Amino acid sequence: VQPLATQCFQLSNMFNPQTEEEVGWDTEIKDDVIEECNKHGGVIHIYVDKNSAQGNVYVKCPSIAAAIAAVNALHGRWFAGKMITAAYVPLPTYHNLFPDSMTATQLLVPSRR
Amino acid sequence: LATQCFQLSNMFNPQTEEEVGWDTEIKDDVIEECNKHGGVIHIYVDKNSAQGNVYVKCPSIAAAIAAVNALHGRWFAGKMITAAYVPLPTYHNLFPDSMTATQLLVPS
Ligand SMILES: [Cl-]
């Protein structure tokens, strides 16, 4: 079987730390993702892993329904010939990686207006 | 806090320990990944750890960073492995033999 949808997922290929040349690039990715999520079910945690070779972005939505909507809105885009992929993370694993994501309930909004 | 040393987590569970060579294969898998980057000079699969911890030391921090950046977030045995750097002294105290270990490890 495939892992059930959870509140939490990991995006890949969102970027390539070797090629990323713009200052504040990871924040723009963060804003881009939140903006995308706020067209759907929002998001309560996000983390762009600047050092990951596969360009990982971690996300947690206020509900699995919100998470599904975000994943479905995000996993379609392409970057640098590589396609973005989402993988759900079980709560304990995601919570172990991101302890603070456990009690975070506030919907995030983008920095840029 | 990049160092020569890191702790992989979620590499296994007590259920993983029921197959022979589970630890030898995990050991080999990490070495293999490290030898695609900067290699590795010490590894310890902590059979007694509940969190499926594997301890690793690379010949240089450049090597470890390359390994960690390749390993963290990576999926292994259906579980997302996470790498957390281990302070060098901590690693050496936990693992005395890793200090003078300079021979690049190769798989079994
Ligand atoms: Cl997992």
Report the CATH number that the domain containing residue A88 is assigned in CATH: 3.30.70.330
Give me the phi and psi of A64, to 5 degrees please: -70, -35
Count of beta carbons in the 10 Å neighbourhood of residue A13? 19
Task: Tell me if residue B29 falls in helix, strand or coil.
Answer: helix
Give the integer Cα–Cα distance in Å for A113 and A64: 27
Burial class (CB in 10 A: 0-12, 13-18, 19+), B27: buried
The shortest C-alpha distance from A53 to chain B (Å) reads 6
State CA B49 to chain mean position distance: 13
Q: Which of A11, A93, A101 to mutate to test the interface with B (most CBs of B within 10 A)?
A: A93
Q: How was this structure determined?
A: X-ray
What type of residue is B37?
A: H
Cβ pair A90, A42 in contact under 8 A = no
* Structural domain boundaries, residue B72: 1-108
- What are the contacts of A70-77 at 24+ separation with CB within 8 A? A70/A9, A70/A33, A70/A36, A70/A37, A70/A40, A70/A41, A70/A43, A71/A5, A71/A9, A73/A36, A73/A37, A73/A39, A73/A40, A74/A11, A74/A33, A74/A36, A74/A37, A75/A11
Q: Which of B69, B74, B76 to mutate to test the interface with A (most CBs of A within 10 A)?
A: B69
Task: Tell me if residue B14 falls in helix, strand or coil.
Answer: coil
Cβ pair A61, A7 in contact under 8 A = yes
Cβ pair A40, B63 in contact under 8 A = no
Residue B88: name the closest of B52, B64, B54 by CA: B64
Cβ pair B104, B40 in contact under 8 A = yes
Number of domains in chain B: 1
- Give the end-to-end CA distance of chain A in Å, rounded to a whole number: 41
Contacts of B25 (CB under 8 A, 6+ apart): none
Q: Provide the phi-psi class of B103: left if phi over 0, else alpha when psi is between -120 and 50, else beta.
A: beta
Give the integer Cα–Cα distance in Å for B108 and A55: 31
CB contact under 8 A, A51 and B70: no
DSSP state of B97: G
Residues of A in contact with B38 (CB under 8 A): none
DSSP state of A4: P
Contact residues, chain A to chain B, C-beta under 8 Å: 10, 12, 17, 49, 51-54, 56, 87, 89, 93, 96-97
Give the integer Cα–Cα distance in Å for B27 and B76: 13
Cβ pair A88, A66 in contact under 8 A = no
- Residue B18, token pair as written in the block: 């029921």
- In angstroms, this model's resolution equals 2.2
Task: Using alpha carbons, list the distances in angstroms from residue A28 to A23, A110, B45, B63, B85.
Answer: 9, 9, 39, 29, 27
Residue A9: name the closest of B77, B94, B80, B35 by CA: B80
- Give the end-to-end CA distance of chain B in Å, rounded to a whole number: 31
Give the integer Cα–Cα distance in Å for A45 and A7: 10
CB contact under 8 A, B9 and A54: no
**Cross-strand partners of A60:** A8, A45
Structure-token match 């723009």, residue found: A28
Element (H, E) at B64: helix B61-71
Residues of A in contact with B82 (CB under 8 A): 93, 96-97
DSSP result, A63-97: SHHHHHHHHHHHTT-EETTEE-EEEE--HHHHHHH
